[PDB]
Amino acid sequence: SGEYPTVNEIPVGEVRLYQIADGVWSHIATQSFDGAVYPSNGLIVRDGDELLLIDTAWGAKNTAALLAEIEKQIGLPVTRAVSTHFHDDRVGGVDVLRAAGVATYASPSTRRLAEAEGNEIPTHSLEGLSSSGDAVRFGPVELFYPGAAHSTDNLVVYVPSANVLYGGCAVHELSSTSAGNVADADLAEWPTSVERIQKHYPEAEVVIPGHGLPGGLDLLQHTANVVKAHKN
Ligand SMILES: C[C@H](OC(=O)c1ccc(CN)cc1)c1cccc2c(-c3ccc(CN4CCOCC4)nc3)c(C(=O)O)[nH]c12
Ligand SMILES: [Zn+2]
Ligand SMILES: [Zn+2]
């Protein structure tokens, strides 16, 4: 009924959308992994009379449900998708997207890691993102590579029309006490990568984490703090 939807409010398999700004939504789904249930976010950005999708809904069936939810709530076709790193909460569902007419994209780093891990592989490579601090335009967003953080390949997404920063899994929600699933992370570089985000996007008004509730710019400093303390 209007609050940001939480893990226990979304059965696995169902997807909700949340309006962030004009022409910007998040998508929220839930999935089981190693015997626990987790929420995860992605982004939808209006691109004229089409939509740009950022990240899958963490699985094939969830991603089919995402497409259905978009059709019901928005009614514009998803034509392109970008995955912001190689884990299943970002690429699981890419095969569904591709068979629904969506062109799927990721950095070459993400594509290599997805292939090596046995995850679904976006079709198209995003060049121009291989060095930390690189940025490229992609439709109505800017893609930014901040350096290694949650993963070595993680990208962030900025929506300049709305000053929305989608941090993906490099950014944690304010309630987080932990750095999340750090198995592929660089805890030592992560603060430095967050500082790059902070420097590059000082006018962000909304910051959306990979998992959990959006907030403001404080999510960035909180993330740095949680990661340093985890390392400690
Ligand atoms: C799909 C993703 O796979 C991986 O990352 C991965 C890594 C390595 C391998 C081995 N090849 C396999 C998979 C994944 C799977 C499962 C979970 C995650 C989490 C996550 C997010 C929040 C929290 C904090 N919660 C915990 C419970 O209650 C309170 C707060 N914990 C974890 C996060 C994330 O941090 O982004 N990515 C999660
Ligand atoms: Zn991840
Ligand atoms: Zn994640």
178 found inside a domain: yes
Instruction: State which residues form the domain around 64.
Output: 7-231
For residues 164 and 18, the answer to whether their CB atoms sit within 8 Å is: no
Domain count, the chain: 1
Cα distance between residue 76 and residue 23, in whole Å: 11
* The pair of three-digit structure tokens given for residue 104, joined into one six-digit string: 């799927």
Nearest CA, atom 26, ligand 1:
180
102 found inside a domain: yes
148 found inside a domain: yes
139 found inside a domain: yes
Name the pairing type of β-strands 36-47 and 16-21. Answer: unpaired
What CATH number is attached to the domain comprising 147?
3.60.15.10
Return the ∠ at Cα 19 (arms to 37 and 4), rounded to 5°: 40
Residue recorded with tokens 């991603």: 63
CA of residue 199 to ligand 3 center, whole Å: 23
The greatest distance separating any two alpha carbons of the chain, rounded to the nearest whole angstrom, comes to: 48
Return the ∠ at Cα 164 (arms to 56 and 134), rounded to 5°: 80
Residues with CB under 6 A from ligand 1: 33, 38, 87-89, 117, 150, 169, 178, 180-181, 183-184, 210-211
207 found inside a domain: yes
| DSSP state string for the chain | --SPP-GGGS-TT--EEEEEETTEEEEEEEEEETTEEEEEEEEEEEETTEEEEES--SSHHHHHHHHHHHHHHT---EEEEE-SSSSHHHHTTHHHHHHTT-EEEE-HHHHHHHHHHT----SEE--S-SSTT-EEEETTEEEE---SSSSTT--EEEETTTTEEEEETTS--TT--S----TT--TTTHHHHHHHHHHH-TT--EEEESSS--B-THHHHHHHHHHHHHH-
* Torsional sign, CA 137, 134, 107, 53: negative
Residues in contact with 179: Cβ distance below 8 Å, sequence separation at least 6, in sequence order: 172, 185, 187, 190, 226, 227, 230
2 found inside a domain: no
Q: How far is CA 78 from CA 51, 54, 101, 146, 193, in A?
A: 5, 10, 8, 26, 30
The experimental method, as deposited, was X-ray
* The pair of three-digit structure tokens given for residue 24, joined into one six-digit string: 């910007």
For residues 86 and 153, the answer to whether their CB atoms sit within 8 Å is: yes
Question: What phi, psi does 142 have (nearest 5°)?
Answer: -110, 130
1 found inside a domain: no
